[PDB]
Structures are given as C-alpha cells and as structure tokens.
Amino acid sequence: EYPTVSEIPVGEVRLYQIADGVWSHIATQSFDGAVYPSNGLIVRDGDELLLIDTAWGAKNTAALLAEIEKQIGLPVTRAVSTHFHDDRVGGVDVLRAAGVATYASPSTRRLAEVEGNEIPTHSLEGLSSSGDAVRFGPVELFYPGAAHSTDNLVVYVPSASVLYGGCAIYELSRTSAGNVADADLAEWPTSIERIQQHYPEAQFVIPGHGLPGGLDLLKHTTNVVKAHTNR
Ligand SMILES: C=C(C(=O)O)[C@@H](C)[C@H]1O[B-](O)(O)c2ccccc21
Ligand SMILES: [Zn+2]
Ligand SMILES: [Zn+2]
C-alpha cells in the first residue's frame, strides 16, 4: 500500500508505482520538531525520466536518485520544482551536479532567490497568469492561481489521469492548515476551483504531503482552508 510517514526513516526514499511509467517518490524530514512525509512525481519520457520536485534536501535527493537508478534504471534528464519552498527546491544543486536540467517558473526562481533557497537553472515560460497551462514532455503544467504560495504549480499526467497538487492540496488526514505565511488564503479556494475545472477527469490525486486520493482531496483542502480562514 502507499507508504506512510511512520514507515520511512529520514534519509531513505520510497517509490510508488501508480501506472505504466508513472511513480510518486516519498521521503520524510523533520521540521519544527515533527516528522513529515513529502511526495513528488516521476514520469517516464521515452527512455528518460522527468522528475517533479526534489525529495526535500540534499541528502534525501541523493537517495532519490540512487533509488531511481536501482528501481527504474533510466536517467532523470529534467526536473520541475512546483514552488520555491525547501521541500520542492532543496536538492536542486544535487540534481544539477548529476546533469539534470532543473526548471521552475520565473516566479518560483525569483522567490527562491529572495528566500535563500536553491534556484532551478531553467525558466518555464507561459505560466504567469492564473489558468495558464503548458505542455512539458509527458505532463501538463498548470498555474491555478495563488494558493499555498503565489507561484505554486500543479502537474497532470494525461496518460495516467494523475494529478499532482503539490503543497496546494492537503491529504485527508490533515484537518488543519500547514504553513500559511506565504499563502493567499483569500484566493486559495478559487485556485482549487480552477484545478477542478481544468482537470475534472483526474482519477489519482497526490497531495504535497501524505496519502493520495481522488478529486475529493480538492474539496477537502477547500474545507480546511476555509475553516482556517474563519479562525
Ligand atoms: C506541510 C507543510 C505545509 O503545508 O506548509 C510544510 C511542513 C511543508 O510544506 B512547505 O512547502 O510549506 C514547507 C517548507 C519547508 C519545510 C516544510 C514544508
Ligand atoms: Zn510550501
Ligand atoms: Zn510542502
């Protein structure tokens, strides 16, 4: 079954096959005295792999590359970071030193620079306005609007009906808000609606942290964000 936070030592990385040529990667990290799991995606791209998000830090991301080589044996040639925070760009330098072409939107690149986080080298154009979508190899990238962060992207894999929401989507077990210092609470439910409207066909939805589900994860996140807004 899908690996949970309690089953993954910090420093180790697990892969979970969703579909032909589609996996999530799962890692864990301490933050503020608690241990969190964290998800990203791996999508096969001919005889190469596209990586979505690092494994939250240099050590984990090196383990992630080692696990991919062991379990899959295809080269990661490009990676996309879905926003500027350390669980999505922490490890970009590891990726770059391994020869991976790292990408993020100009918004994410500017904010990472401001924050002191690692900065993906390449820039994704065409994603600066809410509702914008661009094809990137075997995925579509979508900018739904400000939500968990002003730059957050979601990623859809049309071949597998997989929607990766990143930190803009919460798992069901999370009934209170995560970090919101960088969020746009006022716009977050509207951005989720844009996701629903653009990817109504999605079958497997992956939050930034925790267990995947279906499109009900978008309603769940809306419920939680609105409850937080009101308290
Ligand atoms: C679940 C989270 C959230 O929803 O905030 C947190 C714990 C996770 O997400 B994040 O991109 O904000 C981040 C940054 C740096 C460390 C950890 C995180
Ligand atoms: Zn974040
Ligand atoms: Zn996160």
CSV table of C-alpha atoms and ligand atoms in Angstrom, one decimal:
chain,number,residue,atom,x,y,z
A,1,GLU,CA,0.0,0.0,0.0
A,2,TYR,CA,1.1,3.6,-0.1
A,3,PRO,CA,4.0,4.2,2.3
A,4,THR,CA,3.1,6.4,5.3
A,5,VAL,CA,5.3,8.8,7.3
A,6,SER,CA,5.7,6.2,10.1
A,7,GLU,CA,7.2,3.6,7.7
A,8,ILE,CA,10.0,5.8,6.1
A,9,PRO,CA,13.2,6.6,8.1
A,10,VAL,CA,14.5,10.2,7.4
A,11,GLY,CA,17.2,9.8,4.7
A,12,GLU,CA,15.5,6.9,2.8
A,13,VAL,CA,13.3,7.3,-0.2
A,14,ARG,CA,10.5,5.0,-1.4
A,15,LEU,CA,9.0,4.9,-4.9
A,16,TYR,CA,5.3,4.0,-5.5
A,17,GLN,CA,4.3,2.9,-9.0
A,18,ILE,CA,0.9,4.4,-9.9
A,19,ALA,CA,0.7,3.4,-13.6
A,20,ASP,CA,2.8,2.4,-16.6
A,21,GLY,CA,5.7,4.9,-16.5
A,22,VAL,CA,4.3,6.9,-13.5
A,23,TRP,CA,5.6,6.9,-9.9
A,24,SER,CA,5.5,9.0,-6.9
A,25,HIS,CA,8.5,9.4,-4.7
A,26,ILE,CA,8.1,9.6,-0.9
A,27,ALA,CA,10.6,11.0,1.7
A,28,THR,CA,10.5,12.3,5.2
A,29,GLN,CA,12.1,15.2,7.1
A,30,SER,CA,12.0,16.8,10.5
A,31,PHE,CA,10.6,20.3,10.7
A,32,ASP,CA,9.9,22.3,13.9
A,33,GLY,CA,10.2,19.1,15.9
A,34,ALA,CA,7.8,16.9,13.9
A,35,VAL,CA,8.4,14.4,11.1
A,36,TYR,CA,6.6,15.0,7.8
A,37,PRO,CA,6.4,12.8,4.7
A,38,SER,CA,6.6,14.5,1.3
A,39,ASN,CA,5.7,13.5,-2.2
A,40,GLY,CA,6.9,14.2,-5.7
A,41,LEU,CA,6.5,12.5,-9.0
A,42,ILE,CA,8.5,10.6,-11.6
A,43,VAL,CA,7.1,10.4,-15.2
A,44,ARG,CA,8.7,8.3,-18.0
A,45,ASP,CA,9.6,10.4,-21.1
A,46,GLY,CA,10.6,7.9,-23.8
A,47,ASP,CA,13.8,6.3,-22.4
A,48,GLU,CA,14.4,9.2,-19.9
A,49,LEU,CA,12.6,10.4,-16.8
A,50,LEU,CA,11.0,13.7,-15.8
A,51,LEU,CA,11.2,14.5,-12.1
A,52,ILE,CA,8.6,16.6,-10.3
A,53,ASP,CA,10.1,18.2,-7.1
A,54,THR,CA,13.1,17.2,-5.1
A,55,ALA,CA,12.9,14.9,-2.1
A,56,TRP,CA,13.3,17.7,0.4
A,57,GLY,CA,17.0,18.4,0.9
A,58,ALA,CA,20.4,17.3,-0.5
A,59,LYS,CA,20.7,14.1,1.4
A,60,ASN,CA,17.2,12.9,0.5
A,61,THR,CA,17.5,13.9,-3.1
A,62,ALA,CA,20.8,11.9,-3.5
A,63,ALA,CA,18.9,8.9,-2.1
A,64,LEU,CA,16.1,9.6,-4.5
A,65,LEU,CA,18.5,9.5,-7.5
A,66,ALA,CA,20.0,6.3,-6.1
A,67,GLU,CA,16.6,4.7,-5.6
A,68,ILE,CA,15.5,5.6,-9.2
A,69,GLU,CA,18.7,4.0,-10.6
A,70,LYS,CA,18.1,0.9,-8.5
A,71,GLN,CA,14.3,0.5,-9.2
A,72,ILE,CA,13.9,2.0,-12.6
A,73,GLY,CA,17.3,2.3,-14.3
A,74,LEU,CA,16.5,5.3,-16.6
A,75,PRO,CA,18.2,8.7,-16.4
A,76,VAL,CA,16.5,11.7,-14.9
A,77,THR,CA,17.1,14.4,-17.6
A,78,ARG,CA,14.8,17.2,-16.4
A,79,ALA,CA,13.2,18.2,-13.2
A,80,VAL,CA,10.4,20.7,-12.4
A,81,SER,CA,10.0,22.4,-8.9
A,82,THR,CA,6.4,23.3,-8.2
A,83,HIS,CA,7.1,26.2,-5.8
A,84,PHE,CA,10.0,27.9,-4.1
A,85,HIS,CA,10.0,26.3,-0.7
A,86,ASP,CA,12.7,24.0,0.5
A,87,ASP,CA,10.7,20.8,0.2
A,88,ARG,CA,10.5,21.4,-3.6
A,89,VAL,CA,13.8,23.0,-4.5
A,90,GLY,CA,16.0,21.7,-1.6
A,91,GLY,CA,18.3,19.3,-3.5
A,92,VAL,CA,18.3,21.2,-6.8
A,93,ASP,CA,22.1,21.5,-6.6
A,94,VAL,CA,22.4,17.7,-6.2
A,95,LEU,CA,20.2,17.3,-9.3
A,96,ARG,CA,22.3,19.9,-11.3
A,97,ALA,CA,25.6,18.2,-10.3
A,98,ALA,CA,24.2,14.9,-11.6
A,99,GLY,CA,23.4,16.5,-15.0
A,100,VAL,CA,19.7,17.1,-14.6
A,101,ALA,CA,18.2,20.1,-16.2
A,102,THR,CA,16.3,21.8,-13.4
A,103,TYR,CA,13.3,24.1,-14.2
A,104,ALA,CA,10.9,26.3,-12.4
A,105,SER,CA,8.8,29.3,-13.3
A,106,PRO,CA,10.4,32.8,-13.2
A,107,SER,CA,8.1,33.5,-10.2
A,108,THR,CA,9.5,30.5,-8.3
A,109,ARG,CA,13.0,31.4,-9.3
A,110,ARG,CA,12.7,35.0,-8.0
A,111,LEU,CA,11.1,33.9,-4.8
A,112,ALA,CA,13.7,31.1,-4.1
A,113,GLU,CA,16.4,33.7,-4.7
A,114,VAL,CA,14.8,36.1,-2.2
A,115,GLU,CA,14.3,33.3,0.4
A,116,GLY,CA,17.9,32.0,0.1
A,117,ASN,CA,16.7,28.6,-1.4
A,118,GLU,CA,18.3,26.7,-4.3
A,119,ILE,CA,17.3,28.1,-7.6
A,120,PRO,CA,16.5,25.8,-10.6
A,121,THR,CA,18.5,26.8,-13.6
A,122,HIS,CA,15.9,26.9,-16.5
A,123,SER,CA,12.7,29.0,-16.6
A,124,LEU,CA,9.3,27.8,-17.5
A,125,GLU,CA,7.5,30.4,-19.7
A,126,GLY,CA,3.8,30.7,-20.2
A,127,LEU,CA,2.7,30.1,-16.6
A,128,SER,CA,2.4,33.6,-15.1
A,129,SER,CA,-1.4,34.1,-15.2
A,130,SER,CA,-4.0,32.1,-13.3
A,131,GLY,CA,-5.4,29.5,-15.7
A,132,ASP,CA,-2.3,29.1,-17.8
A,133,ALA,CA,-1.2,25.6,-18.9
A,134,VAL,CA,1.9,24.5,-20.8
A,135,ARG,CA,2.9,21.1,-22.2
A,136,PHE,CA,6.2,19.8,-20.7
A,137,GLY,CA,7.0,16.4,-22.3
A,138,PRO,CA,4.7,13.8,-20.8
A,139,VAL,CA,2.9,16.2,-18.4
A,140,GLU,CA,0.9,19.4,-18.5
A,141,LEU,CA,1.9,22.1,-16.1
A,142,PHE,CA,-0.8,24.4,-14.7
A,143,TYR,CA,-0.8,27.6,-12.8
A,144,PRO,CA,-4.1,27.7,-10.9
A,145,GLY,CA,-3.5,31.0,-9.1
A,146,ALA,CA,-2.1,31.9,-5.7
A,147,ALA,CA,-2.9,29.3,-3.0
A,148,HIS,CA,-0.4,27.6,-0.7
A,149,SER,CA,2.1,30.1,-2.4
A,150,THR,CA,1.9,32.7,-5.1
A,151,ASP,CA,3.9,30.6,-7.5
A,152,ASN,CA,2.5,27.1,-6.9
A,153,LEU,CA,2.1,24.8,-9.9
A,154,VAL,CA,0.2,21.6,-10.3
A,155,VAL,CA,1.1,18.8,-12.7
A,156,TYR,CA,-1.2,16.5,-14.7
A,157,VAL,CA,-0.1,13.3,-16.4
A,158,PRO,CA,-2.8,12.7,-19.1
A,159,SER,CA,-1.7,9.1,-19.9
A,160,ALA,CA,-2.5,8.0,-16.3
A,161,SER,CA,-5.1,10.6,-15.1
A,162,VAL,CA,-2.7,11.5,-12.3
A,163,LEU,CA,-2.9,15.0,-10.8
A,164,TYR,CA,0.0,16.1,-8.5
A,165,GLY,CA,-1.2,19.0,-6.5
A,166,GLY,CA,1.9,19.7,-4.5
A,167,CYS,CA,1.5,21.7,-1.3
A,168,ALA,CA,-1.6,23.4,-2.6
A,169,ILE,CA,-3.5,20.1,-1.9
A,170,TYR,CA,-3.8,18.6,1.5
A,171,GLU,CA,-4.3,14.9,2.4
A,172,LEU,CA,-7.4,13.9,4.2
A,173,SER,CA,-5.6,13.2,7.5
A,174,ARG,CA,-4.6,16.9,7.6
A,175,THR,CA,-7.6,18.7,9.1
A,176,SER,CA,-5.8,22.0,10.0
A,177,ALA,CA,-3.7,24.3,7.8
A,178,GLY,CA,0.0,23.8,7.2
A,179,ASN,CA,2.4,26.7,6.8
A,180,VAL,CA,0.4,29.7,5.5
A,181,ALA,CA,2.9,32.5,6.0
A,182,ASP,CA,3.4,32.6,2.2
A,183,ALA,CA,-0.2,31.6,1.2
A,184,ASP,CA,-3.0,33.6,-0.3
A,185,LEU,CA,-5.9,32.3,1.8
A,186,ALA,CA,-8.4,34.6,0.1
A,187,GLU,CA,-7.6,33.1,-3.4
A,188,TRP,CA,-6.8,29.5,-2.4
A,189,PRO,CA,-10.3,28.1,-2.8
A,190,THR,CA,-10.7,29.9,-6.2
A,191,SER,CA,-7.4,28.4,-7.4
A,192,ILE,CA,-8.6,25.0,-6.3
A,193,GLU,CA,-11.8,25.5,-8.3
A,194,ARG,CA,-9.6,26.3,-11.4
A,195,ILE,CA,-7.9,22.9,-10.9
A,196,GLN,CA,-11.2,21.1,-10.6
A,197,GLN,CA,-12.5,22.9,-13.8
A,198,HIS,CA,-9.4,22.2,-15.8
A,199,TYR,CA,-8.7,18.5,-14.7
A,200,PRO,CA,-12.2,17.2,-14.0
A,201,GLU,CA,-11.2,13.8,-15.4
A,202,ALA,CA,-8.4,13.2,-12.8
A,203,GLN,CA,-8.6,9.8,-11.0
A,204,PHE,CA,-5.5,9.8,-8.8
A,205,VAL,CA,-4.7,13.0,-6.8
A,206,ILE,CA,-1.4,13.4,-5.0
A,207,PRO,CA,-1.0,16.0,-2.2
A,208,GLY,CA,2.3,17.5,-1.4
A,209,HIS,CA,2.4,15.5,1.9
A,210,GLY,CA,0.7,12.3,2.6
A,211,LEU,CA,-1.7,9.8,1.1
A,212,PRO,CA,-3.2,10.2,-2.4
A,213,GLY,CA,-6.9,10.1,-3.1
A,214,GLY,CA,-9.3,11.4,-5.7
A,215,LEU,CA,-10.7,14.7,-6.6
A,216,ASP,CA,-12.3,14.7,-3.2
A,217,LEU,CA,-8.9,15.9,-1.9
A,218,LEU,CA,-9.7,19.3,-3.6
A,219,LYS,CA,-12.9,19.6,-1.7
A,220,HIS,CA,-11.1,18.5,1.5
A,221,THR,CA,-8.5,21.2,1.0
A,222,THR,CA,-11.1,23.8,0.4
A,223,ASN,CA,-12.9,22.8,3.6
A,224,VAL,CA,-9.7,23.1,5.6
A,225,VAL,CA,-8.6,26.4,4.1
A,226,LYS,CA,-12.0,27.9,4.6
A,227,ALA,CA,-12.1,26.7,8.2
A,228,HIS,CA,-8.6,28.2,8.8
A,229,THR,CA,-9.8,31.5,7.2
A,230,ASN,CA,-12.6,31.6,9.7
A,231,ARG,CA,-10.3,31.0,12.8
B,1,LIG,C1,3.1,20.6,5.2
B,1,LIG,C2,3.6,21.8,5.0
B,1,LIG,C3,2.8,23.0,4.6
B,1,LIG,O1,1.6,22.8,4.1
B,1,LIG,O2,3.2,24.1,4.7
B,1,LIG,C4,5.1,22.1,5.4
B,1,LIG,C5,5.6,21.3,6.6
B,1,LIG,C6,6.0,21.8,4.2
B,1,LIG,O3,5.4,22.5,3.1
B,1,LIG,B1,6.1,23.6,2.7
B,1,LIG,O4,6.3,24.0,1.1
B,1,LIG,O5,5.3,25.0,3.1
B,1,LIG,C7,7.5,23.5,3.6
B,1,LIG,C8,8.7,24.3,3.6
B,1,LIG,C9,9.7,23.9,4.4
B,1,LIG,C10,9.6,22.8,5.3
B,1,LIG,C11,8.4,22.1,5.2
B,1,LIG,C12,7.3,22.4,4.4
B,2,ZN,ZN,5.4,25.4,0.5
B,3,ZN,ZN,5.2,21.2,1.4
